[PDB]
Write a structure and sequence with these properties.
The complex is a heterodimer of chains A (about 475) and B (about 280). Chain A has about 475 residues and is of the alpha+beta class. Chain A has helices at about 40-45, 55, 65-80, 85-115, 140-165, 185-215, 315-325, 330-340, 350-355, 360-380, 430-435, 445-450, 465-470, 475-480; strands at about 5-10, 20-25, 30-35, 175, 180, 230-235, 235-240, 245-250, 250-255, 260, 265-270, 305-310, 400-405, 410-420, 420-430. Chain A has a three-stranded antiparallel sheet with strand order 1-2-3. Chain A has a three-stranded antiparallel sheet with strand order 6-9-10, with helices on one face. A three-stranded antiparallel sheet of chain A has the order 13-14-15. Chain A is globular and about 65 Å long. The relative contact order of chain A is 0.21. With about 280 residues, chain B is of the alpha/beta class. Chain B has two domains: about 1-200, NADH:ubiquinone oxidoreductase-like, 20kDa subunit (Rossmann fold, 3-Layer(aba) Sandwich); about 205-285, Irregular (Cytochrome-c3 Hydrogenase, Chain A, domain 2). Chain B is about 35% helix and about 15% strand. Chain B is built from eleven helices and nine strands. In chain B, strands 2-1-3-7-9 form a five-stranded parallel sheet, sandwiched between helices. In chain B, strands 4-8 form a two-stranded antiparallel sheet. Classes of the chains: A alpha+beta (about 475), B alpha/beta (about 280). At the A-B interface, helix 1, helix 4 and helix 5 of A face helix 1, helix 2, strand 2, helix 3 and strand 5 of B. The structure holds iron/sulfur cluster (SF4) (3 copies), carbonmonoxide-(dicyano) iron, chloride ion, fe (ii) ion and hydrosulfuric acid. Chloride ion binds near residues 104 and 407 of chain A. Chain B: Keywords: 3Fe-4S, 4Fe-4S, Iron, Iron-sulfur, Metal-binding, Oxidoreductase, Periplasm, Signal. Chain B: It is found in: Periplasm.
Chain lengths: ~475, ~280
């Protein structure tokens, strides 16, 4: 067959506003363009404010991942202010933020992704849908998917109770500020956090990780597509001591089959195909500028195009798990053997092709959720009830700082420059920015644009795999554009 | 409710939102969000959670809208940006035509039973409309008025709102409509809105005047560090004195905390949020 061009706007069961347009020839995607169609401009809204306000304002980029922005912002402010966060505050922050990794991954798999594979009950918002939706599960396994979707609504809510115990509320925590965390954990509230955590652990171990491998085993073809550049970024997250040198996820870049170090000075944001003034193209974030140009010819997105030493990279659970290569979960090892005939001990034992795939990204996210359980358990042993979690630093007249972390969807940094005790510049380079960006000034596609190449579309009237691929990356276009 | 009861159609449009107003709703304890979706409303369009996609999803909404002309509820999350001919928020494409948030609100707004402006962005403009913005971010009521659209609006603000304020306002309205029909019912709802369009059951009481640290405020005993939970939080920036919400009582996230206990109130339900409540960390 020849060409069909398919536009999907809105792409649903993601966060935020995304259009995807693909060119299909002879049953496969041969080109793609992703458009982030909504802009707010946090980087300009922030200018002129008390810098401390940033750790509230920036959360409103994203109600799914506000703890990530909170974290990046307070780390940036800590550095700019010379705030020395007490050890117990570092741990408390990790408990606040770690709980939202659990929430976000569970939300993503069940409430956003699972309907790609599972038919929900016969009422909105589960119908109508494509007449040929390629829903392959047995009646029993489909029902398990629905039952777990419903249970997961309660589990993700409990994860937000965990966040709120020391974070104040969620979405949009009050409990992280420059200098640490605003509420010392009490013995009683640590009991409450642990009790909720146990319920979440049981759900992750018994339902979520097994269902991803089990559904994956019915969609083995989905490990064979969606590779894209096979290139990944991790900037580090969840500091494990006060040195700034040791993190749960360590930084690294992977591209063209090679591991390389991460040097943030090699990040540049291009705008040829983005709705920003041409003169702002190619800037590192320390010199970043955000000048909207919604009528600029040729542009197709409000997402800038970040490149790392010229490379187009992806971010997220796959990126972190590939870069760090942890041991696989016990249940993952078992199900890989039983359901796939794969012998594996560490994440990379999946191999590059299967890891960097549509279904591999879902597997990576489930594995990472399991991995986070151990981290949280460790923090619950390490935390000291009653020990102070904050310092109260004076606002500097002139300073700069950068905070680096990993949001649930991938690498996140915030840069702040303070002048006359106010925000002079604030630049954000976020996770879905790395994934869902348009072409750069040389015409090289963004990570998801490239991962769309080769996606099968055997039925143009039911082109379900286009958005299935996109959903594997857990896009958050609020974050991508800000 | 029951799986087979009457459940009115709802379309949920996101403008310049962060999805936090959707997420806060997912946190409803009672009724649970599962029960809301399966037993209370029929959520026919919602880009974050619905099965279908793209032009097909838009056309589904349009078919339901035609069937239920004058009768569907329209939830707006986020502000509506008017600059650049609406281009700062495109929400879909159908018939090879892009649909801006401006377009969508002009299309569906006139035909809704009522518009629920959920969150401070939708209600009042919020952060997207704050100083330093350049998109012409506009509140729902102002946008509709400017365009001659007379459909009733109810504001359910907060950044985010508590789920109980969202679900509770829906319950208030559906009860009024059950008792009085649509126009009589909406008139009963409007009677219990304050001057900022907020339901006085949830927004009729001031935080500070009901705060457990009020004695400390009156004594002048002020915490100098966030982690001192004995003193009043006023010197640390608490905006409770200027804020109308019931957070002091229902608290947040299953009652496990609230902003004043944990840190400070930032006045997130108020029409001047954020700029009139900033700086957040001093009085
Ligand atoms: S009101 Fe707050 S939580 Fe709701 S969409 Fe706006 S920024 Fe997000
Ligand atoms: S903590 Fe805030 S709301 Fe409570 S008494 Fe002090 S200023 Fe008022
Ligand atoms: S306590 Fe204040 S900032 Fe917190 S939710 Fe209530 S009104 Fe908003
Ligand atoms: N997770 C998350 Fe949000 C995105 N993309 C950020 O950062
Ligand atoms: Cl997060
Ligand atoms: Fe940015
Ligand atoms: S996000």
């Amino acid at each position: 067959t020849g060409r069909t061009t398919i536009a999907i706007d809105p792409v649903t069961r993601i966060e935020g506003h995304l259009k995807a347009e693909v060119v299909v020839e002879n049953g496969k995607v041969v080109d793609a363009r992703l458009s982030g169609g909504m802009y707010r401009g946090f980087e300009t809204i922030l200018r002129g404010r008390d810098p401390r306000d940033a750790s509230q304002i920036v959360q409103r980029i994203c109600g799914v991942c506000p703890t990530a922005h909170s974290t990046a912002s307070v780390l940036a402010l800590d550095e700019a202010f010379g705030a020395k966060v007490p050890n117990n505050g570092r741990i408390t922050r990790n408990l606040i933020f770690g709980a939202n990794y659990l929430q976000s991954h569970i939300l993503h798999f069940y409430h956003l992704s699972a309907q790609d594979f599972v038919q929900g009950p016969d009422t909105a918002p589960f119908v109508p849908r494509f007449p040929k939706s390629d829903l392959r599960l047995s009646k029993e396994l489909n029902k398990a998917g629905v039952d777990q979707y419903i249970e997961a609504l309660e589990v993700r809510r409990i994860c937000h109770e965990m966040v709120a115990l020391f974070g104040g509320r969620m979405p949009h925590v009050q409990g992280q500020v420059v200098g640490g965390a605003t509420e010392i954990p009490t013995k009683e509230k640590l009991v409450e956090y642990a009790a909720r955590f146990k319920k979440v652990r049981d759900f992750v171990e018994q339902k979520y990780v097994p269902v991803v491998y089990t559904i994956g085993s019915k969609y083995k073809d989905m490990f064979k597509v969606g590779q894209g550049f096979k290139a990944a970024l991790c900037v580090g997250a969840f500091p494990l001591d006060n040195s700034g040198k040791k993190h749960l996820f360590m930084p690294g870049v992977y591209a063209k089959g090679k591991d390389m170090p991460f040097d943030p000075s090699k990040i540049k944001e291009y705008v040829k195909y983005s709705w920003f003034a041409e003169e702002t193209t190619g800037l590192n974030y320390k010199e970043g500028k955000t000048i909207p140009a919604p009528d600029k010819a040729g542009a197709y997105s409000f997402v800038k195009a970040p490149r790392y030493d010229g490379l187009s990279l992806e971010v997220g659970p796959l990126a972190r798990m590939w870069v760090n290569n942890p041991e696989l979960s016990p249940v993952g090892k078992k199900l890989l053997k039983d359901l796939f005939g794969i012998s594996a001990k560490k994440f990379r034992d999946l191999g590059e092709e299967a890891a960097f795939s549509l279904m591999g990204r879902h597997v990576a996210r489930a594995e990472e959720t399991y991995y986070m359980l151990g981290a949280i358990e460790g923090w619950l042993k390490e935390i000291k009830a009653g020990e102070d979690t904050v310092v109260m630093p004076a606002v500097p007249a002139s300073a700069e700082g950068t905070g680096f972390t990993e949001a649930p969807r991938g690498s996140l940094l915030h840069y702040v420059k303070v002048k006359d005790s106010k925000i002079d510049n604030y630049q954000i380079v976020s996770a879905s920015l790395w994934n869902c960006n348009p072409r750069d000034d040389m015409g090289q596609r963004g990570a998801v644009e490239e991962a769309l190449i080769g996606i099968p579309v055997d039925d143009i009237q039911n082109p379900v795999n286009v958005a299935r691929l996109i959903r594997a990356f857990d896009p958050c276009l609020g974050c991508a554009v800000h | 409710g029951t799986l087979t009861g009457e459940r009115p159609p709802v379309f949920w449009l996101q403008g310049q939102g962060c999805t936090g107003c959707s997420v806060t709703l997912l946190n409803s304890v009672h009724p649970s969000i599962a029960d809301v979706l399966l037993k209370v409303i029929s959520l026919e369009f919602h880009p974050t959670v619905m099965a279908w996609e793209g032009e097909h999803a838009i056309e589904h909404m349009r078919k339901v809208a035609e069937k239920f002309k004058g009768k569907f509820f329209l939830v707006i999350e986020g502000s509506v940006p008017v600059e650049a001919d609406g281009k700062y928020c495109i929400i879909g494409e159908a018939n090879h035509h892009e649909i801006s948030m401006v377009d969508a609100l002009k299309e569906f707004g006139p035909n809704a039973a009522a518009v629920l402006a959920v969150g401070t962005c939708a209600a009042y403009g919020g952060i997207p409309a704050a100083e330093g913005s350049e998109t012409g971010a506009t509140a729902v009521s102002k946008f509709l008025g400017d365009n001659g659209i007379k459909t009733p609006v109810v504001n359910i603000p907060g950044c985010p709102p508590h789920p109980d304020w969202i679900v509770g306002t829906v319950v208030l309205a559906l009860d009024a409509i059950k008792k009085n029909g649509l126009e009589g019912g909406l008139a009963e709802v409007v009677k219990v809105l304050d001057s900022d369009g907020r339901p006085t059951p949830f927004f009729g009481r001031n935080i500070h005047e009901n705060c457990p640290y009020l004695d400390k405020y009156d004594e002048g005993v002020m915490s100098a560090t966030f982690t001192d939970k004995v003193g009043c939080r006023y010197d640390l920036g608490c905006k409770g004195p200027m804020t109308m919400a019931d957070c002091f009582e229902r608290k947040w996230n299953g009652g496990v905390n609230w902003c004043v206990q944990n840190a400070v109130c930032i006045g997130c339900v108020e029409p001047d949020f954020p700029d009139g409540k900033s700086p957040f960390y001093q009085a």
